């Protein structure tokens, strides 16, 4: 098998990690196990850190520096590779102990432990402008040789690596997300109902989604306009909590229901990013330099509040209904249903990406 | 004033 | 760039002699280690390394007590000499150091009959 490595400029370190995808499980993590090769020909210092960063990446709006950001830490933990701590006392995975063995003695173990409730790796699309560092939220491993812990750390004398938490589908799928809704008008008697359904509850990245409509129209009147819409809905609870609704693909059939009859149609929605370059704001799977990734996978939650960005589908259907009458205009003539659905990537069956 | 790229080392089997 | 060149080595004959010798091309050459490797026909590829500037003969004791390891300042490389050699010895050679994490060369190759 392969692994990945990393030196910092000046030679003096070389990082090492077993993989760059880790699978975000319910409430387990896996755990971040390595080796951190120290040439005890340059080192004197007798203290080498590594630490690991969970920061949320952000842009200033008052600053018109395509890329420049700062980064807010949710997550920070250290451990002193070289002497062996005192005090922790892990056992090595048996990964490790080949690393040890390829390596020899200069080699020392590093395992980091990710507690659960933490936001996985989002990368927001960045905009037509902006060709520097991604936004969003994003790990990172450094490893750095100093005196003590307060010193500010000499980019040469550092090396930091990119690593990605990632989240696969259920094994087994949940219950067919179905709404209805009835909407009883004040004037008239019979009610307008509207019936939709997907046909499953996981749907994967690129995937048709079946919309069954079951319209009965027991009304006097007619329905003039079917709007589909597939949104992602966005919660990042940070300082303030903010939300907005984007939609990311949409059809917009004219297909009319007469009155007293009713109405069966198989519609056919993909979300795609070729038709999304444009937009801002749109959330992405997370990006290892600045390569494209696609639509950012549902998010799992536990039940409490998470900080960071929950991501959520919904999709929409919106039928527009002529006015007039008695009360013309002033009362609106939409009706919506909104229908929860996972959107995420099947489990690898033989190797990470 | 600079950094190396991410490479890719061996890794013997057991 | 990154240029690297093990010089010499080819056909020796047992109880012989060797000598290897290779260049890094680029960096500052102030402060540094020499992180040599060397492979094996179809294996898992190996340290044998010494010789950091002020001092430093160190040794994986498969191959000690024979290799004049040496470093150089001027020129910018450093040597391997050889001697009385194994059917262990017989391997294909690499000049690396994590000081770029250099990408190798292709290797001298040697045989004992």
């Known amino acids: 098998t392969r692994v990945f490595k990393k030196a910092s400029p000046n030679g003096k370190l070389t990082v090492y990690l077993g993989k760059r995808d880790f699978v975000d499980h319910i409430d387990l993590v896996e755990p971040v196990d390595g080796v951190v090769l120290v040439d005890p020909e340059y080192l004197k210092e007798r203290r080498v850190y590594v630490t690991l960063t969970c920061a949320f990446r952000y842009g200033r709006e008052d600053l018109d520096v395509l890329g420049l950001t700062f980064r807010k830490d949710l997550f920070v933990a250290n451990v002193q590779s070289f002497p062996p701590a005192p005090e922790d006392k892990k056992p090595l995975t048996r990964l490790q102990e080949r690393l040890i063995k390829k390596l020899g003695e200069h080699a020392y173990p590093f395992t980091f432990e990710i507690p659960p409730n933490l936001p996985c790796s989002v990368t927001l699309q960045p905009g037509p402008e902006d060709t520097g560092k991604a936004c969003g939220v994003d790990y990172e491993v450094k490893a750095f040789c100093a005196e003590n812990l307060e010193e500010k750390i000499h980019k040469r004398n550092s090396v930091r690596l990119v690593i990605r938490k990632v989240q696969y589908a259920p094994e087994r799928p949940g219950p067919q997300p179905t709404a209805e809704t009835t909407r009883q008008f004040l004037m008239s008697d019979k009610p307008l109902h509207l019936e939709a359904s997907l046909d499953k509850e996981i749907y994967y990245h690129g995937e048709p989604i079946s919309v069954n409509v079951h319209v009965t129209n027991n009304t006097n009147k007619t329905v003039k306009k079917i709007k589909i819409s597939v949104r992602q809905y966005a919660d990042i609870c940070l300082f303030n909590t903010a939300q907005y609704k984007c939609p990311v693909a949409m059809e917009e059939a004219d297909d009319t229901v007469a009155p007293s009859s009713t109405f069966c149609k198989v519609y056919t929605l993909t979300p795609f990013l070729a038709n999304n370059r444009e937009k801002r704001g749109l959330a992405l799977d997370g990006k290892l330099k600045h390569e494209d990734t696609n639509l950012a996978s549902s998010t799992l939650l536990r039940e409490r509040e998470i900080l960071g960005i929950i991501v959520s589908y919904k999709v929409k259907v919106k039928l527009v209904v002529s006015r007039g009458g008695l009360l013309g205009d002033l009362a609106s003539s939409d009706v919506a249903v909104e229908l929860p659905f996972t959107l995420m990537h099947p489990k690898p069956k033989e190797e990470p990406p | 004033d600079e950094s190396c790229t991410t490479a890719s080392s061996s890794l013997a089997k057991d | 760039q990154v240029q690297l060149q093990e010089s010499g080595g080819g056909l020796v004959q047992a109880g012989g002699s060797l000598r290897l010798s290779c260049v890094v091309s680029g960096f500052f050459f102030d402060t540094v280690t020499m992180a040599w490797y060397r492979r094996a026909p179809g294996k898992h590829r190996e340290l044998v390394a010494s010789?950091?500037?002020?001092?430093?003969?160190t040794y994986a004791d498969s191959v000690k007590d024979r290799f004049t390891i040496s470093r150089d300042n001027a020129k910018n490389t450093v040597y391997l000499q050889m001697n009385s050699l194994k059917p262990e010895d017989t391997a294909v050679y690499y000049c690396?150091?994590?000081?770029?994490?250099?990408?190798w060369g292709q290797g001298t190759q040697v045989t004992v009959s």
């Open positions: 010789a950091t500037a002020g001092g430093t003969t």
């Open positions: 690396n150091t994590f000081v770029r994490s250099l990408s």
